[PDB]
Design a protein around this ligand. Structure first.
Ligand code: HPA
Ligand code: HPA
Ligand code: HPA
Lengths: 282, 280, 271
């Protein structure tokens, strides 16, 4: 669609800046469990994607995604309500543009949640697995979101992903969980992206687990790559919405409903957690 | 290619339904070892893909063969669409979704695969009990794109993708028919291809828990499972994968075809005998 | 861009053949040599109709042999198509290339590797290829090769043996390893988790290039010699403060790598 180059991203950023006076410091990509956080944003300005020229379009059953501006724990945020998952067939530019817009809008930290299957056998339903690293299967293939001409305006041709999941933010998130009595739910792990949209087969899960993957999802990494590429610090957490089935004999099967259910059930806690992290961001 | 949506798929199915009075309950995708299967089909009509508007075209044209096999109404796909050929997701998906509309409840598919598992012998049958969809994991899943809701859910689970009941039946059929010793169950990994796997790739795949490696089938399986078609899939081990970079052994497509053809009669009989035994 | 079929490749080859009399026997792709080939004819890509543009084809003699040096690669992470990446290699085939020598930069996965080490590729793991981004995906160009190429001895064992002997006799055999190159489509460097996974996949070095060219080369019957310069040691622990294209390691080893290539070419069998 529209190339996530500086010209287009500026155009979109400027259109947004006309619509809100909130200069976001924190971008929040609303994933599993963050539905309430998005909702609890203070003094919020809600801008439907449909109202932002050249902003990529996505919907939940026809309802446009929204950019939500306002504050959260006294910090200025922009919340993306409505993501651009690659299994939907969105282009690299589509996925990248909103993140690069965040960059120009002033976002310094991106916080993202997602739903993931627990590969690591110690994980429990409802666990939070803070991403400390990832395995970008599509990226290792030739489906890295950065494939194509590099937009030098945003980042370097060969971005390193050394400390992609900012260790300081991870430490803070863990501390906030600990201080608030749910440190036991919080783990740190390697998230592997399956392009999807099929859930992983038991053989695939077994393989991924053996690759050193703790959780598996179909999202997030592309956004993270774009965020890191343009120098936005990233905090990302997977909500373990289901325990990956490694056994082909099992009759138990992953399903989006239980994924949604776990997200819905953990939303209040995840909101509290994110709000309390935001409150303590440097 | 034309989108494998319900409107287009309906149109194709409807055109086909005007060409045959046979409501197939079993879809068969002929892969390695399934050459002489079309012959065994009775009350059969052969519909060249060329005769079906908006049906994908592949090679002589591919044929949609309807008729009765072992007392059961079948549609047999003669000519498949392999992703390494550059076919689109929609192209590969449409025939399976057409099968769905035509009434197919079970998809039976054979393919040729390299034997990674070191206990496999040339000419063995490896019933797929699971798969590793390397292209799918890497963002080339056949279902990438808007989900066609008339067919299935956005995020299909693949848990019993290779129907355990069909697998059990296939194994029982092989055993009672004296070739149980040829039959394994294993994990099929898809290499997009069209290169055979390097020794290093094979070693990696074997260590990933893969028993056989092929360049086909998974995309159809995914589409079949997405739209609720039960799947039975078997790989004929047409060659033993070479894991050793120092080895002079190597896959050869002619030998692969030869091995497949050699097993064709047995594979046919097996499929026929499985179909005969399917619950009615 | 233009389909890397026999017609288009012929057009380009024929064109190049008007611009030079040099029939190359060896094709060379330097990643991390061309600056020093005798009686060199420097052909800018821009001067070659239908030829991909990013860039020079440098024809001439190297260590007594006619070579074509490809200066300027087409990397998949750049968004170049399969046909674009393949065409230069198929052009080489048409030009007379029988041996392709390629060097590249790679991260050292194998823990025994040191910065500046040479890892001769003896095999590869084509992650994009396994995942449906194989350069050969699409109609097979039958004039060049078969539909399903085997990749047996893809990294010609005799050439590897020779390269090792040359390194040995020239007193830098200590630097030379052989191993498996895995391609990450890129352009991101691999995360520690990814490196760990790749290492455990049996990968010794990781880069973002080369395999597609090698695949095309093998597809059309060109012998391949490929070496990775270990330009950095892959970080496997996400807890480290250590990947950067600022490297540099290539500059350090440039003259050595170049001398090695020259000396290999010197010893190559000649029909
Ligand atoms: O098990 C899963 N696999 C992939 N994505 C997911 N999103 C939540 N659960 C899963
Ligand atoms: O060894 C193989 N690898 C990939 N596909 C195949 N089809 C038959 N044998 C093979
Ligand atoms: O560590 C690496 N990864 C990918 N490509 C490379 N080229 C130089 N080093 C690397």
């Amino acid at each position: 669609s529209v190339t996530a180059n500086i010209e287009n991203v500026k155009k979109v950023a400027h259109h947004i800046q006309k619509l809100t006076s909130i200069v976001p410091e924190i971008g929040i990509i609303c994933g599993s469990g963050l539905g309430k956080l998005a909702d609890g944003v203070k003094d919020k300005i809600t801008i439907p994607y449909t109202k932002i020229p050249n902003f990529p379009q996505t919907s939940v059953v026809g309802h446009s995604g929204n950019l939500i501006f306002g504050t959260l724990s006294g910090r200025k945020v922009v919340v993306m309500q409505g993501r651009f998952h690659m299994y939907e067939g969105y282009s690299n530019d589509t996925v990248a543009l909103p993140i690069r817009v965040m960059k120009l809008l002033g976002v310094k930290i991106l916080m993202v949640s997602n739903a993931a299957g627990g590969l690591n056998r110690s994980l429990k339903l409802g666990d939070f697995v803070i991403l400390k690293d990832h395995i970008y299967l599509p990226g290792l293939g030739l489906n890295n979101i950065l494939v194509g001409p590099n937009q030098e305006a945003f980042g370097t041709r060969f971005p390193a992903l050394s400390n992609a999941y900012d260790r300081d933010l991870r430490k803070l998130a863990v501390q906030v969980a600990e201080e608030n009595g749910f440190g036991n739910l919080v783990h740190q792990g390697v998230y592997v992206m399956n392009g999807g949209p099929c859930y992983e087969t038991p053989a695939e899960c077994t393989m991924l687990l053996n690759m050193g993957c703790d959780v598996v999802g179909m999202s997030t990494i592309p956004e993270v790559v774009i965020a890191r590429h343009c120098g936005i610090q990233v905090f990302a957490v997977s909500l373990v919405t289901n325990i990956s089935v490694l056994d082909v004999e099992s009759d138990l099967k992953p399903n989006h409903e239980e994924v949604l259910a776990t997200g819905a059930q953990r939303a209040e806690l995840m909101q509290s957690w994110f709000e309390k992290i935001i409150e303590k961001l440097p």
